[PDB]
């Protein structure tokens, strides 16, 4: 659980053979986590939204994805979910970029086939079609011979920001409004973030890069924070365990449901304590510091996503 992990949650990186292979829909939790390990979710996203053929993450899988900045805390725990991961699990949507979605400076974009960043009001992904990759500015997809196989290394995927996503405790609208107000009081000179009204202004400068801590608590936009405290609570509920049928791969949905509800399977010490125990299927803890709980503005919430990442902001003009 708490120990930092250098590797997949459950599944070793994919060795695909057929760029035209189907991406099956899998119902089981561990089946989905295996796909997350293999970057099959980012491959699916690229096929749906960019008319890309094949896969990203060939041989490398999720733990060889690129981050901006390279110094990244939450990737040291394989079990902490990124926005693309949370999207695959149905907790949020990484949307297709529109031209008005601002591409932040700083990442090294040249050659990427996919990148995403949190935005003030969501999560946006940028893709490229077959045989293409991003220019240095990230603005266009140009022709690239190195992508011909359609079985691309994980370095072709870029995730922007230090981000952890998790099941949240939903809050009332009135709690969100109070959090938003405290946020406005901490950044009173900020007008728009990623094109979204943050404070009312008359004049404002052009958008400039903006590095900020933030949390996603549902509702219409993120809460950006300067003074705030975070704490990690270790939890041991069923999302905290994955199940492997060793030899075959991840356990099936029905096998996993049985282990987690009926105490008739194998697992690590914590899984036997909470779920019960007796080849077979075995379930063990994923690696993370826990669930993040945020104190801000006199309140305390369990958000959907928390992190530090780069957005675009406009400042008020006198």
């Amino acid at each position: 659980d708490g120990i930092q992990d250098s590797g997949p949650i459950i599944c070793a990186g994919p060795i695909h053979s057929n760029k035209s292979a189907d991406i099956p829909h899998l119902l089981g939790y561990s089946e989905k986590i295996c796909q997350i390990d293999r970057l099959i979710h980012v491959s699916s996203w690229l096929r749906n939204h960019s008319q890309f053929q094949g896969y990203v993450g060939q041989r490398g899988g999720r733990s060889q994805v690129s981050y901006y900045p390279a110094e990244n805390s939450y990737s040291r725990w394989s079990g902490l979910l990124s926005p693309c991961d949370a999207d695959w699990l149905g907790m949020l949507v990484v949307k297709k970029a529109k031209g008005s979605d601002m591409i932040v400076p700083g990442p090294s974009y040249k050659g990427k086939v996919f990148f995403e960043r949190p935005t003030f009001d969501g999560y946006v992904g940028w893709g490229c079609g077959s045989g293409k990759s991003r220019t240095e500015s990230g603005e266009l997809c140009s022709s690239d011979s190195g992508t011909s196989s359609g079985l691309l290394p994980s370095d072709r995927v870029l995730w922007i920001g230090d981000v952890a996503c998790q099941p949240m405790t939903p809050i009332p609208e009135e709690t969100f409004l109070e959090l938003k107000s405290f946020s406005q009081s901490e950044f009173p000179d900020i007008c728009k973030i990623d094109g979204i009204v943050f404070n009312q202004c008359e004049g404002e400068s052009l958008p400039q890069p903006f590095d900020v801590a933030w949390m996603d608590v549902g509702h219409s936009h993120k809460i950006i924070m300067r003074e705030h405290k975070t704490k990690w609570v270790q939890e041991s509920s069923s999302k905290d365990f994955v199940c492997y049928k060793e030899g075959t791969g991840p356990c099936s949905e029905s096998e996993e449901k049985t282990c987690k509800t009926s105490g008739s399977c194998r697992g690590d010490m914590q899984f036997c304590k909470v779920a019960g125990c007796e080849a077979k299927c075995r379930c063990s803890l994923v690696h993370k510091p826990g669930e993040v709980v945020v104190s801000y503005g006199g309140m305390r919430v369990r958000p959907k996503c928390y992190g530090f990442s780069r957005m675009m902001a406009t400042l008020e003009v006198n």
Partner: antibody
Framework: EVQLVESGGGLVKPGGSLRLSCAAS????????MSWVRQAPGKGLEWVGR??????????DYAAPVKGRFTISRDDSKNTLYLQMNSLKTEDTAVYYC??????????????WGRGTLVTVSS | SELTQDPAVSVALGQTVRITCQGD??????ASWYQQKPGQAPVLVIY???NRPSGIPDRFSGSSSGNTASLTITGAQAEDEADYYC???????????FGGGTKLTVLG
């Protein structure tokens, strides 16, 4: 079949001039950033400079020790990278490599190298 | 700005050695790593976050932490005796900077 071949190396007098070229094959040369990297005998690798693809502005950048005397250029129609060396000093004596990022796309991930050509600056 | 490497490091045949590169660019951007044997052109072995070019065995691996990047070689062989260079972009992004190199000696 994807390869880079440097040529033009040889003996040049101190203060002299020398043009290196690099012939690329097996890929669309026009899409590639092309870099020169040199290594004086027994010393470390030293980036000389690069020219970007036209897609990215086709601009040039040079290491400080060669700025002003070295000029990089490309002719996409003949698949060739150039390094024009002027005012050569004896410490410019090195093996010169052209290199690019072919499969490991990214400005400094040099996975494709030529074999290098030796330049000797001597009297 | 510059990448600092140790000039020399030894490892016993079959053992693990770790070569470290340090520089302020590495907080934002990844290093890449090059193996150069005498009389030969450099060969790229690690780039990005622990990506291997095709034909590079996973005995070579990459990591970064803070302003340092590290190359780790498990099960050292005689064929690993080489100079190992890290590189990266500078602050502006207009240049490429190589580390000074680390000569790896394989004992035994």
């Amino acid at each position: 079949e994807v390869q880079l071949v440097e040529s033009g190396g040889g003996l040049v007098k101190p203060g002299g001039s020398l043009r290196l070229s690099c012939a690329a094959s097996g890929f669309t040369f026009s899409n590639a950033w092309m870099s020169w990297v040199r290594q004086a005998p027994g010393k470390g690798l030293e980036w000389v400079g690069r020219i970007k693809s036209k897609t990215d502005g086709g601009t040039t950048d040079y290491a400080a020790p060669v700025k002003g005397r070295f000029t990089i250029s490309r002719d996409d129609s003949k698949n060739t990278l150039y390094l024009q060396m002027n005012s050569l000093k004896t410490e410019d004596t090195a093996v010169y490599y052209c290199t690019t990022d072919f499969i490991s796309a990214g400005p400094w991930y040099f996975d494709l190298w030529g074999r290098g050509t030796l330049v000797t600056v001597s009297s | 700005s510059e990448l600092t490497q140790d000039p020399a490091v030894s490892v016993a045949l079959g053992q693990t050695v770790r070569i470290t590169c340090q520089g302020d660019s590495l907080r934002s951007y990844y290093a890449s790593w090059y193996q150069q044997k005498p009389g030969q052109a450099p060969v790229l072995v690690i780039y990005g976050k622990n990506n291997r070019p095709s034909g590079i065995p996973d005995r070579f691996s990459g990591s970064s932490s803070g302003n340092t990047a590290s190359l780790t070689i498990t099960g050292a062989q005689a064929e690993d005796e080489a100079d190992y260079y890290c590189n990266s972009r500078d602050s502006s992004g207009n240049h490429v900077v190589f580390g000074g190199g680390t000569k790896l000696t394989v004992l035994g």
